[PDB]
Design a protein around this ligand. Structure first.
Ligand code: HEC
Ligand code: HEC
Lengths: 89, 89
């Protein structure tokens, strides 16, 4: 799949930063995008992130109608990369 | 439509309070459930609220498949009532 990290960061800024700026989670600080939280909840994979972005979960909206498959693959790759590098912001 | 306020408050607690506790908006503080904001954005009517709950908007998830139409009508009635009276919490 698509794994354009820089484009993923753009998708992230346009669609995810409202709730996950800097890798946080303003709606649920127990479920951030930080490595330990992704690991805790089985979310440290492209497949898991793609599914949740596409379909939504709980208070997280779905993005499948607004974003292309490549947009979602890119943002998933961006999230996982940032979690491995330690987020900033 | 259904206008069971106390049931609407239960729907609100289970589905909306993660983001709108006390009539606020943790994601976008310019778009709270306070009367002045609902009035400003044309959201101070039952159908405006039911439509946005049903379809989602921006970072707000959709609920149209997860809640019955009466649940959505009840939560809209609760939101309007609380907004007009003044929220607590
Ligand atoms: C606020 C309305 C959000 C938007 C915009 C985005 N996300 Fe989200 N995210 C939000 C919540 C409330 C949760 C927890 C959902 C639940 O009940 O389980 C999440 C969770 C995630 C996760 C998992 C994090 C973890 O388990 O620790 C990921 C990987 C994630 N969100 C990614 C993500 C993306 C890539 C977004 C933009 C397309 C995005 N989220 C937006 C709230 C919100
Ligand atoms: C966090 C993930 C949210 C959940 C859960 C609920 N809402 Fe929401 N709401 C949220 C956002 C980010 C916004 C702004 C959307 C935009 O881009 O315009 C809203 C907005 C509303 C409004 C309008 C408020 C206003 O115009 O001032 C209403 C009436 C509203 N939300 C109601 C509502 C209901 C009843 C919910 C539970 C079913 C609900 N919201 C959940 C974020 C979130």
């Amino acid at each position: 799949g698509s794994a354009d990290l820089a484009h993923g960061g753009q998708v992230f800024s346009a669609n995810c930063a409202a709730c996950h700026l800097g890798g946080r989670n303003v709606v649920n600080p127990a479920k951030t995008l930080q490595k330990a939280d992704l690991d805790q909840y089985g979310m440290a994979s492209i497949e898991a992130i793609t599914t949740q972005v596409t379909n939504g979960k709980g208070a997280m909206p779905a993005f499948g109608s607004k974003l292309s498959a490549d947009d979602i693959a890119d943002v998933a790759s961006y999230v996982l990369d940032q979690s491995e590098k330690g987020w900033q912001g």
